Subunit: 616 residues, 3 copies
């Protein structure tokens, strides 16, 4: 009487009543019962709900497919939906045959069911991956052990952020916000740390991190740390339109080696033509440093570079054939700017390095063959010199008489420079306005020295306490110098050597003995070698205590003249009869030293007359 | 014997011994046994531990709430704690009656138990959500299938980031750091990509993304890509204090259509009054472009706008009734600035568009009725003109005599402009300092042209290689011009037309033949139409090779005078007896052309005398 | 029989066939069976696969260790791998003895198994933590309830982001990208919100948030909100090189209290020396505000501070012993700058506060003992005054004659200031170029007032519609004033008091009656108290309608002279015979009022001669 005791045990397993279990036998009414039993396979299954009266059984096969008068039903599938499983003996490794959807095969302490066609044979030595894979239509993991292992794997294998859907502003419903992944959202920013960058002061070679970061296509790179990012691999080529952003000017990009030939970054165009200049980028909010003097960056055939709030230390910037470069709010310590143009084989010219709101100590600006160097609202302290311009090819062919380029220096301060604050050769169409200069004391040098200048304006500047003259002009022609003050300089205020057609107007020269440093300036203006012509002094207020206010040949032939300069005689038209003006205007007065009388040109008589009206 | 075989199967189910299972009937000693059985419901339950001797059973009700001599216990609740469940036949959808806390009802292949008040019937077609919801006191999901679906759902529906607690710096314990969600932390930044923005070169209409981003309340928007963000929907109104940030000047916000009337963005105040001006914002580090010429942005009744490191291409900025606008470090290619004020019906004025550290090619600045337009440390190349100012309405009511506004142009470069670099009408109280101008060669135009000027200063500029005159002043009164250089211009250096009371001081005029371009300038200064009065030339250094140094009527009545200009005689008081000064200063010297002698005014005798001292 | 019905119940439990269950007894062939049963313990276990024929049982102990002729097997271990468990009665709290690896003990409705040595006895009142902990070799949680609780705990306790492995750019394989955690990646940025900051208008004290954020080592802090961040705790000391970034100038950092002595932030160096100055940082893109007037920030012994795109409201910045401070693109409303240097006990000097592209209304700049205050491209409106400089120690010791410092003011606009636009004391080597000034109308004050000035240049400025004089110089020596325009001022254009050796050149004075406001200026230049010497006026274009063009004593001893000023007589050499010049230059012309004739000094004869050449 084995059957009803079997029905009892099955009922206890399924938590149903004893009379709700039935053996499958053909033709029976399946209605009302909740569990059916197969004698051949000795497997039990829950029956689908709502089997109506008169529904009779036809067949029940190895795959737990139950066929009856009303239709068919997969009891294996139903068991799965109800999480009623049988865990088969053995495992994937030793092999087994899967016949039913609710049969589980253990692999590595984890359970899997087959979702594909049945029956399914797994050979000995199989894995779920080795026998059809994991997913719909294949192996599907079941239960606690499998889930725990899978959760641990995906969280720790790096795939999880890509799986997590993200929408900005959730749980709030925001119109237009789209679904992305947490991976993608996080990828919105790139830090050097993402490529192995570390501010561990030389343990990590951050040069490599930069290289790999840029190689990925990234352009805008942030530094997380406040420490030193050591750089040990030279000549990392920057991509076009880079932007490297430090952590609020805290971290350092630093070379720690001893090789002065080391260079951190290169920026390199394909050629000298404008369509070959590589587009530059931004360095900002960081320190660029080296213990030894280096050229930290080398730029060749480049355009549109920016440096903003960068602290440079022993780190010179070298550019050759460069066009439009901004240094803004930078602090330059022992960090020269070196501008060249010899790589421009087309025009041999570079353009517009610009400095604004910068502080410099021991950091010269040295540009050759460069047009429109501009320095505005800057302070420069110490160094051998502050600003230097050079022209490499000085020879010209007629009708050209001179070669040079404009510089624009405005409302800037140049202080305690050891040599010249300004050492300007080939300065043409330059405007130099409202600057303060105090330089050259350490080497007895002029505060500013312009050698080779044409058609420029130097306006409203102050030159004080310089090591020689405040300003010396050598080989400067057709230029204007108005409103400048020349105070307390060692040897003189303003000096000229072999100049032609200059206007020197207003301003003041002398010594005001202001606390903080001055020499007793002995000379006001001097044409030092007495070989300039067309030098015009008008309205200059000279300190009466000046030993020599003006040193200048103002005889009739030199075209040098003085008008209304205090302590200095007005230039009078005078000289021998031979030196009478050839084509004087009407009523022109000339003191004839031969005759010892004033004479006047009479336009009507076409003769010189004395005051009595008689011809001489 | 059905009772002891049932007890055995139950024992095997719970994994206890056979003599540790008991049937419920009143009065029985419950001690020592581990599982109790209910004959009526045919359900088995674990017994609570530590039931001591002499404790006997009293009742066992509908829900396995068991009452005995020591007290009562909820075996259903106990079963839950032990995860010992019964999965009911059928499902939620077919409807069911839930009776016990350890009973599970399947919905969608997932199991749920009821945690609230019992019993409760679920109707056919019900879900956990439709029948009391999911949570404490309600439906609680149970088991593998439910957990897997919930985890899978939660990860992919966007709700997961909000569930993850985040605190900055973990696992390090950082004082003051608070718990947020990963969702909140991620929402700290807004990218255009978050609102469907895509740099797919015209496939996505990013105008919509901008609109929806701003509507959410977002103000500061970043661009992730380095490609082209197409813009196809015109006139997107910006919110107050926007900030749009490109990816290190790599990506383009670009109009790809052919409609020249297209505009990307509008900024619009509520009215003309100062309390109605909409506060502007920042565009930075990006390209704004169009293949056809457009006004990319239209601003009306606006204040405090900024553009920094923006590359403009064929994209004009049009502002009407605007107040304080900054262009810094921008590159303007074929991208005019157009400023108007006719929408200001209160004061009819716009204020302070400012340009600093900008490069411009073919990009004019054209402002009407605008005060304090300022251009500093800028470079402008080509175009029909560089700077133009206009006063739309010129009428004055007496005693007003003139209408105009100041412009401030400082240390800037204007090169190869086709027409005038400066075309300035209604320039009043202007300061123009240390600029370099070379313009007008293509159209035979003056480098700079000021028509209608009052009380301005133009100081220390250089005008070289211009298409006509370097600078022409027409209808300019009571203004100063010191230290300017006028070199190698086609027709002349400096010209005046119908001017009154001007000072022209120092500087220089001529040609220095510097390599790079020049004309042989034929004229220095010319009062071209001989109709100016009170024109004073002092201390100007002229190139002696100049064909015409000065063209000016300096006869006694004109108030025009020259002093210390090289190659030009000092202006002498001269003329007929009829033209003797009416009230001369003491000892006034006058050359009388009628008499042909110099005469001197004696203040004591009140007469003109000759040099011999006789009255004439 | 009891044995085969037990075998049946076991078979139904494991889902195997009845003849596949066998009882353990020594010597029996274990081959073919799938489940073995221990009658002593009344426990059933699955058997390992591949037990071959002729393999006979030897022993089976309490730990379910099975020994047979071929070898041994741990059935408890096998059961775990197959997830076939027995849940023991009771719980951790009541204590139990764990015998088999597949035995589970409940703690707090969650299940655990023992992975360590067996047997394992847990005393009453135990937890998994109290009895060996959780992990390999110890307690391991099992099943649904345990997993759900662990997932919920880990997700909500803040530890989850640290567990999620992250690599930039996944699933794309990017060379050089390294694995990090989601926690670390999120930690790349710091927002004030991360430390409890909230823009809830005074409910949250954000001062504390800043303090704790900075204490963590964070330097760069962002503000998420657009609202008001209330600040209620004074004197938060900033770290070196902070950067506080607002949300596109939307949010306010605001003091909402009523204590006018309140200060938000301090920045404090360790001493007066340069290596002790605390390195400053950046405030940008935000509003700093207060309802009452406060000094929002106090800086002492500091260097290199920046404020960019900051809107100040009632918030004065007070710095003492400060060096290099930038205000760029700022808007200052009722927000003075106060600079002092008395804390510098070494040199008593502060350096270079600089203002660029700023707008100010009612916000004076007040610096004492400060060198190189620089204002460029700025607009200042209203206030009692705009710019004031003072020197604290005015006494000097011979040979020093004066004490002062340079200011550099360039291309800036000063409008409708109630008092002086510039109130400059101790101005030395200053350059003031291309500015527009209209001030003092409310208090009948000069537009600009320099009291105590040496060796400075004031060039190409416009002074219009001022409340008194355009500019008054008191105790100014050896300075230049060229190209300035003085228009429509109430009392006069340019005035001097006790000055010495000044050049006043070109420019223009008068009234041009341009719509927008003017006075009828009555005076051009006036030496108001007739006590200046060496005052030189050259080439100034005066409005002919001026009542007084020049008021100046130009008698021979004063060294004051006028040349080429319209409507003003040239200073000519004249006087009595006794007053003939001692040591005259060659050909010197002198009008002798005694004789009533001009005479000329002949250098050869060493005599004065008349025009006829006879000695007088
Ligand atoms: Cl002589």
């Amino acid at each position: 009487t084995s059957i009803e005791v079997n029905k009892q045990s099955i009922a206890r397993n399924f938590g149903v009543k004893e009379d709700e279990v039935i053996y499958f036998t053909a033709g029976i009414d399946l209605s009302g019962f909740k569990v059916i039993y197969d004698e051949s396979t000795q497997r039990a299954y829950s029956l689908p709900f709502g089997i109506v009266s008169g529904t009779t059984a036809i067949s029940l096969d190895e795959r737990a497919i139950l066929t009856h008068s009303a239709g068919s039903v997969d009891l294996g599938e139903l068991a799965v939906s109800r999480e009623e499983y049988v865990t088969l003996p053995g495992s994937f490794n030793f092999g087994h045959t899967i016949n039913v959807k609710n049969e589980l095969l253990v692999h590595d302490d984890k359970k899997y069911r087959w979702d594909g066609s049945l029956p399914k044979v797994v050979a000995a030595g199989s894995t779920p991956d080795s026998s059809g894979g994991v997913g719909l239509g294949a192996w599907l993991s079941v239960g606690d052990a499998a889930l725990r292992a899978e959760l641990n794997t995906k969280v720790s294998d790096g795939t999880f952020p890509a799986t997590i859907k993200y929408k900005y502003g959730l749980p709030s419903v925001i119109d237009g916000a789209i679904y992305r992944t947490v991976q993608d959202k996080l990828d919105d920013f790139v830090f050097l740390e993402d490529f192995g960058g570390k501010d561990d002061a030389g343990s990590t070679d951050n040069s490599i991190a930069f290289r790999k970061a840029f190689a990925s296509g990234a352009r805008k790179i942030r530094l997380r740390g406040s420490g030193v990012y050591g750089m040990a691999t030279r000549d990392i080529e920057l991509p076009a339109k880079y932007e490297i952003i430090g952590n609020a000017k805290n971290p350092e990009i630093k070379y720690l080696g001893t090789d002065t030939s080391f260079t951190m970054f290169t920026l390199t165009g394909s050629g000298p033509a404008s369509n070959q200049w590589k587009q530059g980028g931004m360095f900002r909010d960081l320190i660029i440093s080296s213990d030894v003097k280096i050229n930290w960056m080398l730029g060749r055939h480049v355009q549109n570079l920016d440096y903003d709030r960068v602290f440079f230390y022993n780190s010179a910037t070298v550019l050759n054939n460069y066009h439009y470069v901004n240094f803004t709010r930078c602090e330059r310590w022992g960090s020269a700017f070196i501008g060249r143009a010899d790589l421009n084989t087309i025009q041999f010219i570079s353009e517009s390095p610009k400095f604004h709101l910068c502080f410099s100590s021991g950091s010269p600006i040295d540009v050759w063959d460069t047009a429109d160097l501009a320095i505005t609202k800057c302070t420069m302290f110490a160094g051998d010199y502050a600003v230097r311009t050079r022209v490499t090819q000085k020879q010209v062919t007629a009708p050209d008489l001179f070669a040079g380029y404009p510089v624009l220096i405005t409302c800037s301060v140049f202080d305690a420079v050891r040599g010249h604050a300004w050492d300007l050769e080939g300065s043409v169409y330059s405007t130099i306005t409202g600057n303060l200069v105090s330089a050259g004391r350490d080497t007895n040098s002029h505060g500013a020295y312009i050698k080779g200048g044409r058609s420029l304006s130097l306006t409203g500047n102050v030159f004080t306490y310089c090591g020689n003259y405040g300003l010396v002009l050598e080989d400067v022609q057709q230029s204007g110098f108005v409103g400048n003050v020349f105070n307390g300089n060692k040897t003189g205020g303003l000096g000229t050597l072999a100049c032609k057609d200059l206007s020197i107007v207003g301003g003041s020269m002398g010594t005001t003995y202001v606390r903080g440093g001055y020499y007793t300036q002995p000379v006001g203006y001097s044409d030092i070698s007495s070989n300039s012509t067309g030098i015009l002094l008008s309205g200059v207020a000279f300190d009466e205590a000046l030993t020599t206010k003006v040193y200048l040949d103002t005889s009739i032939t030199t075209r040098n003249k003085v008008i209304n300069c205090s302590g200095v005689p007005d230039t009078i038209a005078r000289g021998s009869t031979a030196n009478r003006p050839a084509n004087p205007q009407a009523s022109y007065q000339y003191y004839d030293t031969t005759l010892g009388i004033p004479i006047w040109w009479n336009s009507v008589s076409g003769t010189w007359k004395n005051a009595a009206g008689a011809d001489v």
